[PDB]
Every structure is written in C-alpha cells, then in structure tokens.
Amino acid sequence: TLNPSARIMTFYPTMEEFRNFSRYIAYIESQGAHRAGLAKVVPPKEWKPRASYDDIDDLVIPAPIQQLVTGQSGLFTQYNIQKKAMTVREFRKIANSDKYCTPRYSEFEELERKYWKNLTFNPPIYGADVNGTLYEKHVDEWNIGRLRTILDLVEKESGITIEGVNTPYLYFGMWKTSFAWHTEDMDLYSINYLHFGEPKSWYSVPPEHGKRLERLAKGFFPGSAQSCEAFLRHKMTLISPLMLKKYGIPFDKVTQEAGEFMITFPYGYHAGFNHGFNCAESTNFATRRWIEYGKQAVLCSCRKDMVKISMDVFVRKFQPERYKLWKAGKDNTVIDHTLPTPEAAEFL
C-alpha cells in the first residue's frame, strides 16, 4: 500500500509545514516513511539553525574515541578506545590532515567500496557523544534541544534526565568513522541534523524485517548472543551490505548532506559512516505510536546503568484502559510495523 517497496523516502516541507514537528512526523508516516526505518527531510532554504559556524573553534570534545575494527568477510567488531580531550579546532586539523582525510574518488560507490575495504586499517578518531547544541536559542522550528514531543514526560513528570536521549548530542566526524548496527534506546525515534561539512552515509533495515537481522547477527556471534540477548545495543557490530544481500536481509542506503535531517523510526536498524570532517547534532524523540515499541523493547542486561525508561507514565496517560492489564503482565498486544501513528487521522 504505502511504500510497498519500503524504500527510504525524502521529504521537502514548506516553512509552514516545518513549523509543527510532531505534525510533520505524523504526515510523513501517513506517506509510509516509517516502513524503511529511516527517512530524509530537507529543510526549506530560508531556514537556518544558526547564522555562522566559525565561532565554535573553542568548543571542547571531552572524550574522543579511536575506533579499532577487527574482522573479515564483511563481519566486524568495533572497539572504541577513549582518548584525551581536544577542541574542535584541534579535531579539524587532524581530520583534514593527509593521514585521516578522504581519499580521491569519482562516485559514491567507490568511496563506499573503500570504506568496506579499509575500515580495519588506520583507525580514525570520532568526536562523538558531546553534550551540547549548535542551535540558536531563538530557532523555534525543529530545534533538537526542544522538540516538544511526548518523550518530555520523562523529564517533566518523572524528573529524569538521560544525556543524548532527552538532551542533544554533537558528533564531530572524520573519514571512515562509523556507527554500528543498532536501534535507538527503548526503540525510540531519533533525529539527526548535519550542521556542516562532508556527508554521512546511512544503511537501514525496515522495522518489519528487523528480527531477521537479529537472527543473522546471533548466528554470526553466538558467544555475544549468549552473554546478552540485546548485544547489538553495544553498538560494536558491523555488517557490510554485501553480507546483508548474501543472507537476504532487505535494506536501503542513503547519503545525508550538510543541512539535511535524518529521522530514524522505532525498531529501525541503522548503521553508517562519515565521508570526512563534519558535525552532526542528534537526539531521541517519541510519538504515540512509539509507546507500544517502548513497552516491548528488548534491553541490554549485561552492562550497568544502561538506558531504561519507565513506561508507566505513558501507559497510564495514553492507554488507561490497558494499564491494569499491562501492570499484571497480561498485555498481549502485537505491533504492526506498517501502521501509521494515530495522530495522522486528518492526513489519511
């Protein structure tokens, strides 16, 4: 019906559509965008999150990670080793230097090839997980610091703050820096804006096929699966498109350019890599449709202090008629990944 091919969709809102975030997410879901697990949203040309990016050179990256990768035949494991702090200024110099810079290429496929050929050599440094926002306090549209979604009920009612989830994160990339296959904490949505710099390429598995990817990864890494059910949440596992194709996992790819938003959808598996020096800002968010995902999310057991959000406030507020049953462990609801969020009543 709506995106029967489940391919990644791109959207081009007017400033008027840009004004209401939750509504536009509802709209693109009514168009089937969520079926791919990932979507691109290009803001109108007039919109800018900030006027200029040169006043940021003194911003500190407290905990850079060197990404060491081991593996073969399209299956890899990534070990992130923490490094001493540096500024953006210092990071740019290392990123744009001849050792870590993007190699020469004609078309994207070549660069993609070089990424999967070279990802275990010359480990790069990733400026990840930096608390902060590059938005300007007066930008009211699609502000990653305040999106006004129902996820706020974690802070506003329960008083809990979870860094990177209900607060913004910055990511300073260089060539070959990557993010492994994962869904979001509590299978939330995420939003990602590339502020400036070289592109970020993404891979995505449709939520309706997510279980097939999990079985695949379990088969490849049984030791890891025995130790933790949700081990993919460790964000250590890299699997090439050739392997996905070989084993019959549906997926799509898309490249994100400076000034573009990417939205990931509940239980969308995604992975990717940065083309060169860049800066991205990201956070999680939610809609009504997410509540059932949150209730059913399989979480990491093996590590201390992992992100676990109490679903109680959500069930209580948006599903009062199911609350008693849910508290009793008797809620048998099955998720249909193809369905849009209820907020799209008007659009359909």
Binding site: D129, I162, E163, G164, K235, K308
Partner: peptide, 5 residues
C-alpha cells in the same frame, strides 16, 4: 545513564 557510541 547516558547515550553511548
């Protein structure tokens, strides 16, 4: 608790 890469 925080988000980790």
């Amino acid at each position: 608790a925080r988000k980790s890469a």
